[PDB]
Amino acid sequence: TGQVSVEIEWELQKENSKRWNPEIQYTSNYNKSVNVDFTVDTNGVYSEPRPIGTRYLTRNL
Amino acid sequence: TGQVSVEIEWELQKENSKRWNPEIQYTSNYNKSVNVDFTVDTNGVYSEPRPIGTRYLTRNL
Amino acid sequence: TWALPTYNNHLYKQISSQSGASNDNHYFGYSTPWGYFDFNRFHCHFSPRDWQRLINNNWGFR
Amino acid sequence: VFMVPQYGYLTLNNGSQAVGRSSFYCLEYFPSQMLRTGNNFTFSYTFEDVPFHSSYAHSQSLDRLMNPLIDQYLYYLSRTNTPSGTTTQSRLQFSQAGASDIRDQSRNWLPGPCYRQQRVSK
Amino acid sequence: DGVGNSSGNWHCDSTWMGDRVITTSTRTWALPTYNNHLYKQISSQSGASNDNHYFGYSTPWGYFDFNRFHCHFSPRDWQRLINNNWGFRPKRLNFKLFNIQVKEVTQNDGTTTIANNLTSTVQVFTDSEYQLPYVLGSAHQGCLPPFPADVFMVPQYGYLTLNNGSQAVGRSSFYCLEYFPSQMLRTGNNFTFSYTFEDVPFHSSYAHSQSLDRLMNPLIDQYLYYLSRTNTPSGTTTQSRLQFSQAGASDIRDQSRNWLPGPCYRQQRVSKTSADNNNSEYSWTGATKYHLNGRDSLVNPGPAMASHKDDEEKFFPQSGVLIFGKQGSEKTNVDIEKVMITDEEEIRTTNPVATEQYGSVSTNLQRGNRQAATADVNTQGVLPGMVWQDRDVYLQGPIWAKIPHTDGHFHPSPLMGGFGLKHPPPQILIKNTPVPANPSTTFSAAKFASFITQYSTGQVSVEIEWELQKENSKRWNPEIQYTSNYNKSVNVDFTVDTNGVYSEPRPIGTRYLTRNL
Amino acid sequence: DIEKVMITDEEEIRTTNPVATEQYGSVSTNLQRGNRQAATADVNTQGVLPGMVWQDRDVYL
Amino acid sequence: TSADNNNSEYSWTGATKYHLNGRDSLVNPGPAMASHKDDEEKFFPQSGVLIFGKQGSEKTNV
Amino acid sequence: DGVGNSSGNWHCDSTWMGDRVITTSTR
């Protein structure tokens, strides 16, 4: 047994949009729930509730 | 008559949170509508549909 | 782009509340031929997207 | 396109009438640059240092700042009287606040000032 | 250096150098594996009243706290400090974790076998950036013990976030402590780090010798007039005539004064003698409280204000003072003799009495056909010109507290007393690294549950440097100092009994020297 | 009518700021004793007291 | 004006005061606040203003 | 160094620097 550690460096292409109206972003729901999303429950079991895909910002063709 | 132009420089305090679960952000609704939010209608009348307040990110006390 | 008329026909005027007005609503002042610029509302400088960019990402600004 | 607002100001008043202290200002008394077509007017300003406006909402309430697992070491007045046979007798009893009685934990801080309002519903 | 070379040397002495004091204290600690190495979500019980709801998490991490004064000062050291100094404050601190021990317990067959595990490690990290909820300064248990000999058990870290009753709102924050880089230690390693406090005002260790109401010269009259008498006799029936006078020794209550006492949020008054107190359950219904988000929360201790007027040592505010427990006191519903109730008579010169109303104010415009009426103020907000004294700090009392990160805090000195720091000493979190037992030879994606039982032990040492404001009084008659009683007793104060149990018999507050206003 | 305006919402500052509609707290107004029950009164207006913390009003677009 | 004022000894019972250590002490002058509204130069606070004596005024009950 | 000296220090943080991000994770 023992520890393993992986580090990765990622480059980014910053969003530069000049769109006027507000875009769509990813937000956790404001409403109350017995468990918060992406967190251990009463028995200590982490769980990813939904799949998150990278496409929320929009650009023209 | 004539043109007026005002420029302002604003300083920012970048969010540095180490929270694990995803935070709440401001997003326009995904659903279809006869008018998009924050845009001129059929007759060219711009309109701010809802008030937007600055408090969405969360920090501890 | 802005447009500026000639207010008060180029004359300073003294103005006050109406005799009928309740005591809470009395006032006395002047109206001037001058027009002023104001941009004290936030949307004057930020566009909705710009505003979105600002709130989502920053803890503070000034 | 917008229309420039018209400037006016209010000073002291005694009802409709204006008291002696009231100030009348002639705007022209101030030097003002005169522009013709093909001229421009620019000027620059730097704000004073001011505190950043918080664009965050706290994730922890003030009443809840303590650790749920460990009890405090300070005591509070839990129960003022205790049963004595059939009729209850005045006896003071103290306890240490814990998760069970969070409302009673000792705390360093107090909420913000309040001037109360009336409540109307949508 | 090596497995068999000690990481550090034990240090416990207080050394005084002019106006500076360094107090070092070393303790041995033990750290279990909390929550079986699993983060857990915790909340109040369905039955719990709405005032008692909460939602948060319990973490496998254990933290160090030393926010109690006796952790650093010995009773004699404390005596030296109060008698001699008008003020003091913390300057900087040094913290060390050395002689780390990790052991393994084999509990098969009803007999427990404990043995070294030189390979296993402890993860320690300091939250120097304050991205973790600060659980310090809430007067929790587990402080480095007052007595040096005692061994203590490291507290377990947990935190509370937003909640809507039992349920947790969307805004609630879940923090993974591991997400923070934490240095890993083996036996024969050490962890040290240093911190320097921010400039803060000295905590007054003096009690004023002059009351606020009395600051004037007894011999000379004022030159300002006050409304002495509103009406005067006119034959048989008295007539409305205004008369003015200059206040003097004779009518001291009337002298004009520049200053006002400190703000007051009023308390309920309960007496140490059972007889006086009313026979009813007013512990909560009669208590002074504030409201946040629909939850009534008891205001304890509350704004600093004297506990009792003259000759009323018998009384004390319901929740307006600190109350420490005598050694051996249980958790729930102890009798009065089992606690120690603190006493704030010192601040009465400038601070109101918690039980009494701040003042009287006139509420109606009088006239010929309407008598002059006034009403009491039980709650006065700060007004310009007020002066007050912050709450006292005791040997068993808290040292500091994190000022909440908000737009506005006014006079942000912790209400329990202590030093209100913006950037307080960072929380130190330590957790045994989990070690997996014999795994199954065939692969399985499910997470492990069969860890090797472990606990770690070792020494911890904290040093703090304190600055002093030496007493410079030119008073003629002798002052009041703190002295142990001359009389014989079966046990000396502040010492282990026949069975080796250290015990602090009484609370010691810093205010004995006196200065003028 | 109400539908013709937009009413702002300050739920964010509730963690440290009182609820505008509700009273700040309760304070005891009489000295109890054997023959006198313990009574308290609500405070609808509390001035700043030492130790208070609060959040300034939000700014909107 | 003597007439307006009520015919009673309210100099102390009716006065605004604060309490320190069980002693009621008159709050004079007290926090700065205007002495009278418009057109009420006739009135003044009981102990809310400064009062100087004209030259030659005695000590008690002038 | 030795049997009783830890080989490494635990790292898990993501740090953002302009258009670059470094994400480290230890298990």
Question: Minimal CA–CA distance to E246: which of G50, C35, D80?
Answer: G50
Whether E389 and E262 have beta carbons less than 8 Å apart is answered as yes
Does the beta-carbon distance from C4 to B8 stay under 8 Å?
no
Instruction: Give chain B positions within 8 Å (CB) of C43.
Output: 48
Burial of D118 per CB tally in 10 Å (0-12, 13-18, 19+): exposed
Provide CB contacts within 8 A for E175, sequence distance 6+: B18, B19, B20, E57, E131, E132, E133, E159
CATH tag for E1-517 (out of 3.40.640.10, 2.60.90.10, 2.30.30.830, 2.170.30.10):
2.170.30.10
Q: How far is it, in rounded angstroms, from Cα E93 to Cα E69?
A: 14
Provide CB contacts within 8 A for A25, sequence distance 6+: A56, B25, B26, B27, C52, C56
**Interface chains of chain D (3 or more CB pairs under 8 Å):** B, C, E, F, G
For residue E507, what are the CA distances in angstroms to E47, E141, E206, E414, E443?
37, 17, 16, 19, 61
- Across the B/C interface, how many CB contacts are shorter than 8 Å? 58
Whether E78 and E69 have beta carbons less than 8 Å apart is answered as yes
Whether C29 and D8 have beta carbons less than 8 Å apart is answered as yes
Instruction: Give chain C positions within 8 Å (CB) of D52.
Output: 59-62
- Token code pair at residue E243: 């008369």
Whether E175 and E158 have beta carbons less than 8 Å apart is answered as no
DSSP category for residue A39: S
Whether C46 and F61 have beta carbons less than 8 Å apart is answered as yes
Residue D10 three-state SS: strand
Does the beta-carbon distance from G3 to E361 stay under 8 Å?
no
Question: Minimal CA–CA distance to F17: which of E404, D119, E56?
Answer: E404
Residue E72 three-state SS: coil
Instruction: Tell me which residue in D24, D51, D55 faces C30 most closely, judged by beta carbons.
Output: D24
- Token code pair at residue C33: 């031929």
Q: How far is it, in rounded angstroms, from Cα E25 to Cα E64?
A: 14
Q: How far is it, in rounded angstroms, from Cα C31 to Cα C29?
A: 7
For chain H, the residue count is 27
How many Cα atoms occupy the beta-carbon half-sphere of F41 within 13 Å?
14
Q: How far is it, in rounded angstroms, from Cα D90 to Cα D82?
A: 6
Residue of A nearest to E166 (CA): A34
**Interface chains of chain H (3 or more CB pairs under 8 Å):** A, E
Q: Is there an interface between H and A (3+ Cβ pairs < 8 A)? A: yes
Whether E179 and B20 have beta carbons less than 8 Å apart is answered as yes
Instruction: Give chain D positions within 8 Å (CB) of F22.
Output: 116
Instruction: Tell me which residue in B20, B28, B39 faces A24 most closely, judged by beta carbons.
Output: B28
Does the beta-carbon distance from F47 to E412 stay under 8 Å?
no
Domain boundaries, chain E: 1-517
Q: How far is it, in rounded angstroms, from Cα E494 to Cα F58?
A: 53
DSSP category for residue E287: S
Instruction: Give chain D positions within 8 Å (CB) of F7.
Output: 122
> Which residue out of D1, D2, D3, D6 would a mutagenesis test of the C interface target, given it has the greatest number of C Cβ atoms within 10 Å?
D6
Instruction: Tell me which residue in B21, B38, B39 faces A37 most closely, judged by beta carbons.
Output: B21
- F59 phi and psi angles, rounded to 5 deg: -115, 135
Q: How far is it, in rounded angstroms, from Cα E301 to Cα E89?
A: 22
Whether E413 and F50 have beta carbons less than 8 Å apart is answered as yes
Q: How far is it, in rounded angstroms, from Cα G43 to Cα G52?
A: 17
- B58 phi and psi angles, rounded to 5 deg: -125, 140
Whether E482 and E508 have beta carbons less than 8 Å apart is answered as yes
Q: How far is it, in rounded angstroms, from Cα E62 to Cα E74?
A: 26
Strands E428-432, E454-470: pairing is unpaired
- E347 phi and psi angles, rounded to 5 deg: -85, 5
Instruction: Tell me which residue in E348, E362, E370 faces G16 most closely, judged by beta carbons.
Output: E362
Instruction: Give chain E positions within 8 Å (CB) of F14.
Output: 292-293
Does the beta-carbon distance from G47 to E238 stay under 8 Å?
no
- E108 phi and psi angles, rounded to 5 deg: -65, 145
- D29 phi and psi angles, rounded to 5 deg: -60, -15
Partners of C14 in beta bridges: C30
Does the beta-carbon distance from A28 to B26 stay under 8 Å?
no
- Token code pair at residue C26: 């009395």
> Which residue out of G13, G16, G19 would a mutagenesis test of the E interface target, given it has the greatest number of E Cβ atoms within 10 Å?
G19
Strands E400-402, E419-421: pairing is parallel
Buried-exposed string B14-37: b where 16+ CB fall within 10 A, e elsewhere: ebebbbbeebbbbebeeeeeeeee
Partners of E194 in beta bridges: E94
DSSP category for residue E128: T
Q: How far is it, in rounded angstroms, from Cα E381 to Cα E263?
A: 6
Instruction: Tell me which residue in H22, H23, H27 faces A4 most closely, judged by beta carbons.
Output: H27
Strands D87-96, D75-84: pairing is antiparallel
Question: Cβ of D108: how many Cβ atoms within 10 Å?
Answer: 27
Instruction: Give chain C positions within 8 Å (CB) of A22.
Output: 48-49, 51-52
Does the beta-carbon distance from B20 to E179 stay under 8 Å?
yes
> Which residue out of C30, C40, C46 would a mutagenesis test of the D interface target, given it has the greatest number of D Cβ atoms within 10 Å?
C30
For chain B, what percentages of helix, strand and coil (3-state, to nearest 5) are there? 0, 15, 85
Does the beta-carbon distance from A42 to E38 stay under 8 Å?
no
**Interface chains of chain B (3 or more CB pairs under 8 Å):** A, C, D, E, F
Q: Where do the H-state alpha helices sit in E21-87?
A: 75-84
Whether E305 and E351 have beta carbons less than 8 Å apart is answered as yes
- D58 phi and psi angles, rounded to 5 deg: -65, 140
Q: How far is it, in rounded angstroms, from Cα E73 to Cα E24?
A: 9
**E414 upstream amide cis, omega within 30 of 0:** no
Instruction: Give chain E positions within 8 Å (CB) of F48.
Output: 381-382, 410
Measured over the CA atoms of residue E262, residue E268, residue E271 and residue E275, the dihedral's sign is: positive
Q: Is there an interface between D and F (3+ Cβ pairs < 8 A)? A: yes
Strands E152-153, E20-31: pairing is parallel
Q: How far is it, in rounded angstroms, from Cα F39 to Cα F27?
A: 9
Q: Is there an interface between E and D (3+ Cβ pairs < 8 A)? A: yes
- Tokens 């008295």 belong to E238
Q: How far is it, in rounded angstroms, from Cα E67 to Cα E142?
A: 10
Question: Minimal CA–CA distance to E33: which of E96, E99, E100, E104?
Answer: E104
- Token code pair at residue G4: 């307006």
Instruction: Give chain C positions within 8 Å (CB) of A17.
Output: 49
Q: How far is it, in rounded angstroms, from Cα E67 to Cα E402?
A: 11
Residue E121 three-state SS: coil
The CA-CA-CA angle for residues E144, E145, E147, to 5°, reads: 140
Provide CB contacts within 8 A for C40, sequence distance 6+: none
